[PDB]
Amino acid sequence: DLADRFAELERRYDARLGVYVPATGTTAAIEYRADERFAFCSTFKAPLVAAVLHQNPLTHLDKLITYTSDDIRSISPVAQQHVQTGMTIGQLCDAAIRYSDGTAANLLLADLGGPGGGTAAFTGYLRSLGDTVSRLDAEEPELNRDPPGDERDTTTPHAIALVLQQLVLGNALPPDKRALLTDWMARNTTGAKRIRAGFPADWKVIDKTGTGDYGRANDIAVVWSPTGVPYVVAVMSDRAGGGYDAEPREALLAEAATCVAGVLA
Ligand SMILES: *C(=O)[C@@H]([C@@H]1N=C(C(=O)O)[C@@H](S[C@@H]2CN[C@H](C(=O)Nc3cccc(C(=O)O)c3)C2)[C@@H]1C)[C@@H](C)O
């Protein structure tokens, strides 16, 4: 029983776990706590890059953005390296997805603009995709720090799965921008030990991870069977029982993804 397996994993990792896979032609929706709120953490960066792509001509990717010391306020593996020269919007989108760069996300929010340093416009973008659940309220690093149960900066496995489905599989973006987003996620470097670990090598996996305080570890992916049948997989978790400094546990997501892949194969 799948629900039983997911419950075994929650006890194993002292965690709360959320899973959603949207229904297809012959597969029923997979859902476990799928309508409970979980912190986005960095998973918001996938629809953020979509919002920025949507909002501008494609060649806005070639605009150079400059920033300095006081702009580096969170984990930023790429932005720290380029602070002296700047980064184009294209580089920022690339860093935000593939390295989960926090500074790149803040600069991309600022590019999108409007109230809340871009957070209101980001939330408005999800609303345009029919997501009436998710909300972004803060930028990096504060967006990962809301206490357990607090609705600020949250989504649900169900809501984010349907957003990602529209972005990658559906028509939310024109084909050229849709390919940009899909390729960045295909080239992600942070996800080898999460959804990717749960699916056999001959399944294609693209993803965007999230990690935060209270032992938060998320992964949202699109996967394709060896015959090109796609599925959207949203896995979210926290270990709030360990307090603010609880260790995020990727293995939980790998195991949950293995359970999902078992059902989809
Ligand atoms: C968003 O969830 C959060 C990001 N997202 C992360 C993720 O999805 O894994 C991590 S960043 C990822 C895991 N940690 C390493 C890291 O710290 N790399 C690194 C390497 C060299 C330099 C630097 C640096 O200068 O900062 C970092 C990569 C993270 C929790 C927030 C912050 O967006």
Side-chain angles (χ1 to χ4, degrees):
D1 175 287
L2 199 58
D4 286 345
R5 295 280 179 230
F6 289 143
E8 288 168 24
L9 296 177
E10 291 186 310
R11 298 192 292 277
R12 187 170 306 158
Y13 294 89
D14 190 35
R16 187 180 57 116
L17 173 67
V19 186
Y20 194 76
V21 178
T24 67
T26 52
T27 71
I30 294 163
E31 54 185 9
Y32 187 84
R33 304 196 190 284
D35 292 314
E36 300 188 13
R37 288 177 179 273
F38 293 78
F40 266 118
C41 304
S42 287
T43 66
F44 82 101
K45 295 166 194 178
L48 175 61
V49 166
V52 170
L53 287 165
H54 166 87
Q55 175 68 25
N56 301 278
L58 200 137
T59 58
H60 183 60
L61 300 183
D62 311 296
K63 178 165 193 198
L64 186 79
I65 304 308
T66 56
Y67 55 100
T68 35
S69 307
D70 68 6
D71 295 298
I72 303 164
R73 310 174 190 152
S74 62
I75 290 158
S76 305
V78 183
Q80 59 91 14
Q81 310 189 59
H82 294 273
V83 62
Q84 312 186 247
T85 58
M87 292 172 65
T88 62
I89 292 292
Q91 284 183 288
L92 294 164
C93 290
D94 184 297
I97 292 172
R98 295 186 51 243
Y99 289 92
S100 199
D101 193 294
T103 293
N106 283 356
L107 293 169
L108 289 174
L109 283 164
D111 195 71
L112 192 56
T119 55
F122 170 88
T123 302
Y125 185 69
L126 304 184
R127 295 286 177 270
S128 81
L129 303 185
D131 180 353
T132 59
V133 167
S134 315
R135 50 180 295 180
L136 192 62
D137 296 278
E139 68 185 6
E140 307 271 21
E142 288 86 5
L143 70 85
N144 309 286
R145 294 172 176 174
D146 311 296
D150 193 310
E151 305 197 346
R152 284 172 69 90
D153 306 304
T154 58
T155 190
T156 67
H158 185 184
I160 195 62
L162 300 176
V163 169
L164 188 50
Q165 190 171 227
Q166 289 174 254
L167 297 182
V168 170
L169 299 173
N171 299 327
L173 294 162
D176 52 10
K177 304 181 169 171
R178 181 195 314 152
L180 282 160
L181 171 63
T182 302
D183 291 0
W184 280 319
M185 294 186 71
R187 298 173 54 239
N188 178 33
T189 74
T190 66
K193 303 180 76 182
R194 298 171 183 208
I195 291 179
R196 176 69 280 181
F199 280 84
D202 65 349
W203 289 63
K204 175 181 194 196
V205 173
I206 80 178
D207 80 304
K208 175 75 210 68
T209 54
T211 305
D213 304 294
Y214 303 100
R216 292 167 178 149
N218 308 323
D219 199 16
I220 60 169
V222 188
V223 318
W224 281 261
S225 77
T227 48
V229 178
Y231 298 92
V232 178
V233 186
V235 181
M236 310 186 77
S237 78
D238 65 79
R239 304 180 64 248
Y244 187 85
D245 55 348
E247 290 280 3
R249 300 281 290 277
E250 307 197 278
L252 170 63
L253 307 181
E255 291 210 67
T258 301
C259 291
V260 170
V263 162
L264 303 180

